[PDB]
């Protein structure tokens, strides 16, 4: 009993339209970087009729550093090497193999060096939609003047936040944003009804909540707070179809007490497997540190790498290379709860049935 791409499938779940784009599933995979979603899970997602999201950050490491022009201690040479617009033409090329004209999404992160560069190439790429969130994104249309079609959606964990990017955004550039991600820092439950509320006030912008979201039962509450949809990324980290191929064999032994919050030196905190280059500093063998990639810029050039102890862009990069040993590598408070590690068309039926 398997269910393939030439059945149908009955659901009571409704479109979602996010600017002049539309969605079959009220659902967006998040992006993962480094290297997690980009052709092989986005196009698949969006094949699927959820929201595909490529991850633009580090995509020099693509295929190897296929795309980059300099290379140091093999690591991308720069941010103009680190986020690789060619890289990011060739995943959005192969993402569309797939999935066709069917809406793509490209997560940014705020405090990259080169933001609005890698904005404009991720619109010239094909992104139909930008989410952005470490960080308050007042600027996104800076960006994006020259691709009108292309909806941008930040990421904010309150309504405070969805006020004053709607003004700032709305006496700027006479525009607001086409929809908001809402995640927690507070309770989800909590937060949707009161950003949903703030909405109100310029148009009920659509709200997407994230974080936490496992199953339907998990969705349908969502909605019926008001959200008008989900974003999962966990769910898809467990898909076979996920670009950064360890994850297939690390998710399935994850127990609970291995998942912990770190610092970074991005300055935010990430949530981590204890295994890679956690277990290395642990032991006193650490990876040096030399910032080459120049990731992101609350680090000042690795002075706050080397303060916390790792380089998340190396890092990173080396658990998309395969690197068991010294790899990074991230996951969702319920990563603990995969066991199998099961496709794309098979999980998209299991949210959407009914
Ligand atoms: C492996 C991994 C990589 C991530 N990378 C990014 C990223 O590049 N950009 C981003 O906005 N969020 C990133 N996140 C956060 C997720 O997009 C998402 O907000 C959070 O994990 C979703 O909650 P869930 O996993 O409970 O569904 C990452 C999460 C994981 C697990
Ligand atoms: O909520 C959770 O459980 C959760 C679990 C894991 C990650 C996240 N958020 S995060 O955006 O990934 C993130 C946070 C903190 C520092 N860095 C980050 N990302 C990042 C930075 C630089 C590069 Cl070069 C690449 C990437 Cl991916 C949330
Ligand atoms: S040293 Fe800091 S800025 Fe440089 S690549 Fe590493 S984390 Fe990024």
Redesign the pocket.
């Given at each position: 009993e398997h269910h393939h791409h030439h059945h149908h499938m009955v659901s009571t779940l409704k479109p979602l339209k996010i600017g002049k784009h539309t969605i079959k599933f009220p659902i967006f995979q998040?992006?993962?970087?480094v290297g997690?979603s980009w052709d092989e899970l986005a196009g698949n997602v969006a094949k699927e009729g959820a929201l595909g999201v490529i991850?633009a950050?580090g995509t020099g490491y693509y295929k190897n550093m296929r795309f980059v022009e300099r290379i140091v201690a093999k690591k991308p040479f720069e941010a103009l090497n680190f986020y690789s617009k060619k890289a990011l033409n060739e995943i959005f090329a192969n993402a569309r193999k797939i999935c066709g004209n069917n809406p793509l999404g490209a997560?940014i992160?705020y405090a990259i060096n080169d933001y609005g560069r890698v904005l404009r190439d991720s619109c010239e790429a094909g992104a139909n939609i930008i989410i952005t969130?470490?960080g308050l994104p007042t600027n996104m249309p800076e960006f994006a003047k020259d691709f009108s079609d292309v909806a941008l959606i930040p990421?904010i964990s309150s309504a405070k936040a969805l006020k004053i990017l709607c003004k700032r955004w709305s006496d700027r550039y006479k525009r607001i944003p086409d929809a908001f991600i809402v995640?927690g820092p507070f309770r989800l439950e909590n937060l949707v009804p009161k950003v949903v509320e703030a909405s109100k006030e310029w148009g009920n912008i659509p709200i997407i909540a994230?974080?936490?979201?496992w199953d339907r039962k998990d969705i349908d509450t969502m909605l019926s707070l008001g959200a008008s949809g989900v974003?999962?990324?966990?769910?898809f980290?467990g898909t076979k179809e996920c670009d950064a191929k360890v994850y297939a064999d690390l998710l399935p032994t994850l127990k609970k007490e291995d998942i912990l919050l770190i610092k970074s030196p991005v300055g935010y905190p990430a949530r981590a497997i204890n295994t890679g280059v956690i277990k290395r500093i642990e032991e006193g063998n650490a990876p040096k540190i030399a910032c080459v990639s120049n990731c992101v810029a609350p680090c000042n050039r690795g002075e706050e790498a080397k303060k916390v102890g790792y380089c998340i862009a190396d890092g990173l990069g080396r658990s998309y290379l395969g690197n068991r040993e010294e790899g990074l590598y991230?996951?969702?408070?319920?990563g603990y709860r995969v066991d199998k590690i099961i496709s794309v068309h098979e999980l998209i039926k299991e949210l959407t049935e009914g």
């Open positions: 998040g992006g993962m970087g997690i991850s950050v997560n992160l969130g470490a990421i995640e994230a974080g936490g979201i974003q999962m990324a966990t769910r980290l991230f996951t969702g408070a319920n």
